[PDB]
Design a protein around this nucleic acid. Sequence first.
RNA 1: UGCGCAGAUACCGGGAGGAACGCCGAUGGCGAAGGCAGCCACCUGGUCCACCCGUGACGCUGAGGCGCGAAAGCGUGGGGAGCAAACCGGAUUAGAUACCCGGGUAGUCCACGCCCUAAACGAUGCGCGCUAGGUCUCUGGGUCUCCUGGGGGCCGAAGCUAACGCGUUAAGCGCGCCGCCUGGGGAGUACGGCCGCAAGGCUGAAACUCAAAGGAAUUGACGGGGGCCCGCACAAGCGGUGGAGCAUGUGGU
Lengths: 155, 70, 116
Amino acid sequence: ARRRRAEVRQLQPDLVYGDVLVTAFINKIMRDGKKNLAARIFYDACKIIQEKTGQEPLKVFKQAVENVKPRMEVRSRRVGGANYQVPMEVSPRRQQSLALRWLVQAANQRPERRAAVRIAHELMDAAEGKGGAVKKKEDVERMAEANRAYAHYRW
Amino acid sequence: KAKVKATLGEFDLRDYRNVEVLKRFLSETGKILPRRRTGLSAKEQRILAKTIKRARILGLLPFTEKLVRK
Amino acid sequence: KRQVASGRAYIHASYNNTIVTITDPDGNPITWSSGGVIGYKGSRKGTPYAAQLAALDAAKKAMAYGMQSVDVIVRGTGAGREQAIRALQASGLQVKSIVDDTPVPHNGCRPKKKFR
RNA sequence: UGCGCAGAUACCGGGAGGAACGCCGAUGGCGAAGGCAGCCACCUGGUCCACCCGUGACGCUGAGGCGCGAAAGCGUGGGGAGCAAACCGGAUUAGAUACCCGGGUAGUCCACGCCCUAAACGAUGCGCGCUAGGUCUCUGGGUCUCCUGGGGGCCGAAGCUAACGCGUUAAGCGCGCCGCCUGGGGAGUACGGCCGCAAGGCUGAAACUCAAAGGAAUUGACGGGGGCCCGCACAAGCGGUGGAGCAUGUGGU
Ligand SMILES: [Mg+2]
Ligand SMILES: [Mg+2]
Ligand SMILES: [Mg+2]
Ligand SMILES: [Mg+2]
Ligand SMILES: [Mg+2]
Ligand SMILES: [Mg+2]
Ligand SMILES: [Mg+2]
Ligand SMILES: [Mg+2]
Ligand SMILES: [Mg+2]
Ligand SMILES: [Mg+2]
Ligand SMILES: [Mg+2]
Ligand SMILES: [Mg+2]
Ligand SMILES: [Mg+2]
Ligand SMILES: [Mg+2]
Ligand SMILES: [Mg+2]
Ligand SMILES: [Mg+2]
Ligand SMILES: [Mg+2]
Ligand SMILES: [Mg+2]
Ligand SMILES: [Mg+2]
Ligand SMILES: [Mg+2]
Ligand SMILES: [Mg+2]
Ligand SMILES: [Mg+2]
Ligand SMILES: [Mg+2]
Ligand SMILES: [Mg+2]
Ligand SMILES: [Mg+2]
Ligand SMILES: [Mg+2]
Ligand SMILES: [Mg+2]
Ligand SMILES: [Mg+2]
Ligand SMILES: [Mg+2]
Ligand SMILES: [Mg+2]
Ligand SMILES: [Mg+2]
Ligand SMILES: [Mg+2]
Ligand SMILES: [Mg+2]
Ligand SMILES: [Mg+2]
Ligand SMILES: [Mg+2]
Ligand SMILES: [Mg+2]
Ligand SMILES: [Mg+2]
Ligand SMILES: [Mg+2]
Ligand SMILES: [Mg+2]
Ligand SMILES: [Mg+2]
Ligand SMILES: [Mg+2]
Ligand SMILES: [Mg+2]
Ligand SMILES: [Mg+2]
Ligand SMILES: [Mg+2]
Ligand SMILES: [Mg+2]
Ligand SMILES: [Mg+2]
Ligand SMILES: [Mg+2]
Ligand SMILES: [Mg+2]
Ligand SMILES: [Mg+2]
Ligand SMILES: [Mg+2]
C-alpha cells in the first residue's frame, strides 16, 4: 500500500457465536475455499472442548487466543552493510492474525488423527499456557529482549 | 532575551580590573558572548575581548568553566 | 569495607565504548564497569544499552560500599552518553548534580588524519 | 594486528616537555604579493581622516638590476609532545604495491645559510580621467532621519561580452607604460647558457605527427547526486515452481 491506508476487511459475525473472531479463525482453517468443511471442523471441535472440559468453548477460544498474542517481535532493517534484527512492538491488528495463524499451524503439527481433535486439544493446551502455538509466541518474545541492544533503531 | 549592553550602566570597556561588569559578558562557561548576545558594536567587541583576556591572566576571569546541566 | 556513602561517578563516553568510574568525594575510585565488563565484546560496547548496563553494573557495585549520594561527571560525546545518565538516576543512587567536563583543547595538538 | 596481571583503560594529585592558540571570530580587519590570530612590553613599516599651512609639475609606468617570496625539499647544529612520506604490521579484496585499523623514520618546530616553484587565483598588470542608482558592512570627519571621505560585499543604469557574466572595487569609455599570446601533440622535452651543494629552476626548440585541440551555452541521456510521487516494485500474506513421475516446447547431440 503506497497510496492509501489499506482499510481492514469487516468479516461477517459468526453464525453460531455471533462473534467475528470465530469467523476469522474458521477462515484460517479453510483451505481451497471449503468453508463448509472448515466450520464443521471448528464446530465439532467445540464439542470436544466442551465435553472433555466442562467450560464454555466460547471463553476458552478467546483465552487461548490471548495467550498466543506476542507483545513484541523483530524485524530486519538494512544498516551499514548487513542488516539487523530490530525488536519493536506488534500492532494490535498484527497480534490478531499472528496468534490465529500460529494456533492453526501448531494444531496441524499435532499428533492427533482427526482435525477437530487437534484443534480442540491445541486450544485446550494454548489456553493452559502450553502447546505449540504458545512456544512460537514465547520464542518470538525471546527474539525481542535479546537484540534489545538495537532498541535505538525503532523506526 | 535582553542584551548585555542594554541592561548595564556607563562602564569603561578598557578597564580589565572591574570583574563585576566583565563577568556579565562571560557565558555559563568561560567563553565570551558573541555580538548577538552582547549587543556591542564591532569596535566595542574588539576592545572587550582583549580586556577580558587581560583579566584572564590576572586570574580575575575564568579561562573555562563547567556546565551543570544535561 | 569502606562505607563512603557518597561520592562522584564519572561517565567516559566515546563512539567505540562507554565506561563508568565511581569515586569517593576526593576523587579516588571505588568500583567501575564498562561495555566490556558486561558481556559485550565488539562494536556492541558502543551501544547505549551497553552504557545502560555498565552504569547499572557500576551502580550496584557502589551499593556494596554503601553509596547513596552521587555527583555525576560526564566526559565525551557518544551513543549512550545520555542513556548512561538516565540509568544512573533510576539506579537507586540519588544524583546530586550533573556536570559536563569534556576536555576540549584550545587547538594545541594536531589531530589524527581521522579528525581533520 | 596492538596494548593490559611487570596492574592498562577510566579517576584524583604532582611533575616534565614540545607544539598550537578555543570562545571573541565575522559574509571582519592588515599587507605589494607570499601571507598575518592567546597576552604583555620595546623597536618598526604601511595606510586613512580633518585643517588648506608649506614646496611648486617635483609626475606615471618600467626592459635590466636588486630585495621579498606558502608548502615541500637541502646543509650545519639543536629540538622532538602530537601528527606523519618512506617503511613495519592488521584487515579488505579476484589481487590491495590503496582507501580503513595498529605502529612508525624523515619531516613538520628553532637558529643560520641555500632552494625561487604553485590553481603564487580576482586564473582579471600599474597609474589617472570620465559614466544612474539601491543595499549590507569595516574605519575616519561632520551642523550626526542624514551628509561626507577611505576600504570590504551584493543587486543592478548606460555600455561591453561568444555566452556565462562584468558593471564608480569595469571585464564600460579614454590615455600613458611594462609583460605576454599566434592550432593540438612532440614539450616545458633536447641542446647551449646562466644559477644551485643537490633536488632542480630561469631561458626554451626542431624533425616528425594530427584535422583537430579548445571556450561558453542548448536539448537530452546518465549518476553507487538531491527533492516529490506512482505500479503485486518491495514489504504484509496466501498458494506455487526449482526435487519426483509424466505431457509439451527449446538447447545440445
Ligand atoms: Mg551496498
Ligand atoms: Mg568497539
Ligand atoms: Mg598480550
Ligand atoms: Mg607482556
Ligand atoms: Mg593527571
Ligand atoms: Mg622530552
Ligand atoms: Mg571561528
Ligand atoms: Mg587590501
Ligand atoms: Mg591566499
Ligand atoms: Mg605600531
Ligand atoms: Mg605606525
Ligand atoms: Mg595652499
Ligand atoms: Mg608661491
Ligand atoms: Mg612605481
Ligand atoms: Mg625587474
Ligand atoms: Mg633572493
Ligand atoms: Mg622559500
Ligand atoms: Mg618550509
Ligand atoms: Mg632540516
Ligand atoms: Mg600516530
Ligand atoms: Mg598511519
Ligand atoms: Mg599494507
Ligand atoms: Mg593481506
Ligand atoms: Mg574488488
Ligand atoms: Mg621568477
Ligand atoms: Mg590590459
Ligand atoms: Mg561618526
Ligand atoms: Mg565604497
Ligand atoms: Mg553583478
Ligand atoms: Mg544593457
Ligand atoms: Mg578604472
Ligand atoms: Mg573579455
Ligand atoms: Mg615566456
Ligand atoms: Mg605545432
Ligand atoms: Mg604548443
Ligand atoms: Mg616544470
Ligand atoms: Mg642548440
Ligand atoms: Mg641545461
Ligand atoms: Mg654545478
Ligand atoms: Mg632527497
Ligand atoms: Mg620538477
Ligand atoms: Mg583548460
Ligand atoms: Mg564545457
Ligand atoms: Mg528543462
Ligand atoms: Mg535525474
Ligand atoms: Mg551498482
Ligand atoms: Mg554508499
Ligand atoms: Mg511481484
Ligand atoms: Mg514477497
Ligand atoms: Mg521436473
